[PDB]
């Protein structure tokens, strides 16, 4: 049961991304819920496109807001929940400064805080691990 | 009756008078007069007389109000009883079937921590055993606590008297209704009880359980109380970088300041800071969470930026939101402050692209050049980009918006080495329609140094030369500047060296070239043209001459530390600048003493006579801010009687409409005439009736500003420094030796003392202590010090202007 309620949601692969009434768009991998993005306003997922290379989002309005899918992050996350680890951390190169601590943080949720240790940028982060 | 202290006449009259109505005016009459604090006992009896027995409740409640605010007090019907005029019937009053006048007995009653009423309110809780309300049950368990209070801690207030003693606690947790008087010293069975009822709660009741006993293991259970303790439970469970996103503390939290653009201001500061923690340099200060609200992916839609440029201002919102929302876009995003002030800066400073944000008055135009180009003077990367955005301000070409422009582009070259070399043919341009000095100054001073990259000069300087406009600073500033860089390396029809001419005519000689300068006397008085005239050994050339002064930079030039540069964004700096950030014979002697820190005038009254002057009385007066701690007390002066009598002493009070002299002491006696006269102790002054107040750099600066201080006096014994005679002195005429305005070094370092102080006097007293201690060959008067002094009207500047000087009293009785 996930923490972040599904106002809208789509199904990417086996991934659930999800509108909550937070404004947050969020994925479910693993029974967790992490924050793919946070929306300003209030969106609806109309699907996604890939020709687009996007999520086409609509407002109260019947036009189209895009929103790319942060794939790096997600299969960082996905990689992890499956407990694949060292897999997530072939992902970390393009996972930038704050996003590695954060990503590493969902490692370590799931387990291994050594390889949260080596992707986390931050030394605080490794200090602690 | 509203308060009228003399009405106790009428009031017996009213008091009693076979109608009902009359006789509750009277008594209401009496209370309004006693809860103001005024004359009540004569009444007594009357009072008493008609309500005592009755279950009529009003005149009963009236009375039952009358018993908790004087009834101790007052004497005349009640005297001194266990079973007093304030309950001996109102045991009928308890024992009534209505429940309101049971209800109100108990109530005052048991309220009293009276000891002459403690037996009649143990069993007043049975007026309120039996619960007809919530208000009853309630009215008990506080009753039953206050009994508690009133002295019994024991075995006369615990247990129940039928229903309840201490014990209305433990069963308003089980009953319908709850409230809990058990926040301390009572049964441990009902605190456990209070527990139970978290639960079963009543919710006004719920608060009671709460003060008492507070934490949850849960998430809530229900109601606003519940709900208050729970955020503060909360803070506890994640104390780290603040709440960050505040949690149920938000609700209060707008009130606290409902007028009206400060809650949106704060609101915009927490939400600048939620966004992201940053480095934390110089204005980068955004603490709470590093990721929350993140900054800056490339797939965001529609992003955080949006939401980043309202925090860059101009005022977009009102002023106070403005200059939050300023230091806000700051602290998120720069690099320290540099970055991010130099976008909002090139938003602010004068185009010619907008023309709602150049404006035609010279210096905020001028301080806004300054601004952007301080950004390139802290961080080299914003040099790049300063300068051409500087040359789009110079574009608007009127004399003054190019003249402004000129002037700190013209600074940033002294930093700058032959670096702004692309920029002087963009500033020549406008110099040729011309009205002011400014323009004038900019120009050739850019023209002057940037030499061996143009070749125009003679015929730029020479259209304005023989133009007119304003010229004085124009003199100072092309003197210095003209010939520079390269020895021949122009030529229009008139080389570098028709410059070094032309240079020097302008600074004060004379030379046919450039169609003859405008002006060549100079400005100010110092200046004068002959330096660089002197000057210029080798011809405008990178050397020992101006060309080097004008390639170099005064000092060091660094930073936004105010060296060569301006110290932010100039419209928020106004607002940062404002802010001060302010932190019948007689005969006396006597003598002050001090004993474990009890300050005390003494006196002793002598009656050297032998006359009577029995009636003596003793008294010590509160003149104004001078006041008693407590009079002399003895009934001493009589005849051939020595005393001694104590009159402590403050210094610290509130003016009093008596006289305002020295101290006034009073001494009474046998004399019908002068019954009461006064007399007096020794010495204390005016002075004292000043208050001690301090001030900073910036509030004595905006006081120098604010009212003259021209007043100086030169005050002996002042010889020495600040620390020593002159702050004890200075402390004694309330005030006190705080900042400085001196500027010390070999020749320099008179000591500068700024005072503040806000007397009790309608103004406040300043003034600056300079001591005139020798620094140089030639003193002023040698050791003794001049205080320039000031007041708001200079009533006190006077004070301070002797009361620096000496100062003693001692005597040895």
Same mark, same amino acid.
């Given at each position: ?30 029974? $967790? ?97 | ?337 540099? $970055? ?18 150049? $404006? ?208 932010? $964004? ?244």
């Amino acid at each position: 049961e996930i923490q972040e309620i599904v106002k809208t949601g789509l199904w990417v692969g086996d991934c659930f991304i999800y509108t909550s009434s937070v404004n947050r768009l969020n994925y479910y991998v693993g029974g $967790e819920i992490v924050t793919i993005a946070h929306l300003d306003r209030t969106m609806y997922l109309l699907g996604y496109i890939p020709k687009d290379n996007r999520l086409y989002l609509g407002d109260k309005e019947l036009n189209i807001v895009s929103y790319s899918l942060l794939v790096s992050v997600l299969e960082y996350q996905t990689a992890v929940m499956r407990r694949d680890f060292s897999m997530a951390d072939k992902v970390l190169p393009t996972i930038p400064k704050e996003q590695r601590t954060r990503v590493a943080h969902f490692l370590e949720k799931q387990g291994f805080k050594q390889q949260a240790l080596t992707v986390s940028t931050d030394p605080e982060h490794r200090f602690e691990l | 009756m509203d308060s009228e202290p003399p009405s106790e006449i009428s009031l017996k009259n009213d008091l009693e008078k076979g109608d009902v109505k009359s006789k509750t005016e009277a008594l209401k009459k009496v209370i309004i007069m006693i809860l103001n604090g005024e004359k009540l006992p004569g009444l007594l009896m009357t009072i008493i007389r008609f309500v005592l027995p009755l279950q009529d409740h009003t005149i009963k409640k009236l009375l039952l109000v009358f018993w908790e605010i004087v009834p101790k007090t007052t004497p005349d019907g009640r005297l001194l009883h266990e079973m007093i005029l304030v309950c001996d019937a109102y045991r009928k009053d308890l024992q009534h079937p209505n429940e309101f006048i049971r209800g109100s007995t108990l109530r005052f009653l048991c309220k009293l921590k009276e000891a002459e009423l403690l037996e009649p309110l143990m069993p007043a809780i049975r007026a309120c055993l039996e619960h007809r309300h919530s208000y009853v049950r309630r009215n008990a368990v506080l009753a039953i606590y206050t009994i508690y209070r009133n002295f019994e801690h024991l075995i006369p207030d615990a247990p129940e008297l039928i229903h309840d003693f201490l014990v209305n606690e433990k069963d308003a947790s089980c009953k319908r209704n709850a409230f809990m008087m058990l926040i301390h010293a009572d049964q441990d069975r009902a605190l456990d009880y209070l527990s139970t009822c978290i639960d079963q709660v009543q919710t006004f009741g719920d608060i009671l359980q709460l003060v008492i006993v507070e934490l949850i293991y849960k998430v809530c259970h229900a109601n606003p109380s519940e709900r208050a303790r729970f955020i503060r439970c909360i803070y506890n469970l994640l104390q780290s970088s603040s709440p960050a996103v505040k949690y149920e503390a938000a609700g209060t939290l707008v009130t606290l300041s409902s007028a009206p653009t400060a809650i949106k201001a704060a609101a915009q500061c927490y939400i600048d800071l939620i966004i992201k923690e940053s480095d934390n340099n110089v204005k980068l200060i955004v603490l709470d969470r590093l990721v929350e609200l993140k900054e800056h992916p490339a797939h965001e839609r529609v992003l955080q930026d949006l939401v980043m440029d309202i925090l860059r201002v101009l005022s977009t919102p009102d002023l106070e939101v403005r200059k939050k929302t300023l230091q806000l876009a700051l602290d998120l995003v720069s690099s320290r402050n540099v $970055e991010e002030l130099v976008i909002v800066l090139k938003k602010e400073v004068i185009k010619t692209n907008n023309v709602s944000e150049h $404006e035609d008055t010279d210096k905020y135009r001028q301080l806004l050049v300054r601004t952007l180009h301080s950004c390139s003077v802290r961080f080299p990367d914003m040099a790049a980009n300063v300068i051409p955005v500087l040359m789009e301000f110079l574009s608007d070409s009127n004399e003054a918006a190019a003249a402004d422009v000129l002037e700190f582009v013209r600074e940033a070259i002294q930093r700058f080495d032959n670096l702004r070399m692309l920029i002087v043919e963009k500033m020549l341009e406008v110099f040729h329609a011309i009205k002011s000095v400014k323009i004038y100054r900019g120009a050739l001073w850019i023209l002057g140094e940037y030499c061996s990259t143009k070749e125009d000069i003679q015929s730029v300087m020479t259209e304005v030369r023989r133009s007119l406009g304003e010229i004085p600073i124009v003199e100072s500033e092309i003197k210095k500047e003209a010939g520079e860089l390269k020895p021949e390396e122009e030529i229009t029809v008139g080389p570098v060296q028709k410059l070094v001419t032309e240079m020097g005519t302008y600074a004060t000689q004379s030379a046919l070239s450039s169609s003859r300068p405008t002006k060549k006397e100079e400005d100010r008085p110092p200046l004068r043209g002959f330096l660089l005239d002197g000057d210029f050994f080798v011809a405008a050339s990178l050397a020992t001459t101006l060309t080097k002064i004008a390639l170099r930079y005064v000092a060091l030039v660094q930073e936004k530390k105010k060296q060569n540069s301006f110290v932010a $964004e100039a419209m928020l700096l106004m607002a940062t600048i404002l802010h001060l950030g302010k932190s019948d014979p007689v005969y006396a002697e006597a003598y002050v003493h001090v004993n474990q820190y009890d300050i005390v005038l003494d006196v002793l009254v002598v009656n050297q006579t032998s006359d009577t002057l029995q009636n003596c009385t003793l008294e010590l007066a509160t003149l104004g801010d001078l006041k008693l701690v407590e009079k002399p007390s003895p009934l001493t002066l009589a005849p051939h009687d020595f005393a001694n009598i104590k009159a402590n002493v403050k210094v610290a009070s509130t003016e009093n409409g008596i006289i305002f002299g020295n101290i006034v002491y009073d001494v009474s006696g046998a004399a019908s005439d002068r019954n009461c006269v006064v007399l007096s102790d020794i010495h204390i002054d005016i002075m004292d009736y000043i208050q001690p107040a301090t001030c900073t750099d910036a509030e004595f600066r905006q006081m120098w500003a604010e009212f003259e201080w021209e007043n100086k006096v030169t005050v002996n014994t002042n010889m020495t420094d600040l620390n020593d005679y002159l702050q004890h002195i200075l402390k004694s005429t309330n005030m006190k030796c705080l900042t400085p305005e001196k500027a010390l070094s070999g020749y320099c370092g008179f000591m500068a003392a700024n005072l503040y102080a806000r007397s009790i006097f309608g103004e406040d007293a300043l003034a600056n202590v300079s001591i005139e201690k020798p620094v140089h060959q030639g003193p002023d008067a040698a050791v003794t010090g001049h205080i320039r002094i000031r007041a708001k009207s200079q009533g006190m500047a006077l004070s301070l202007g002797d009361k620096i000087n000496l100062s003693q009293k001692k005597t040895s009785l």
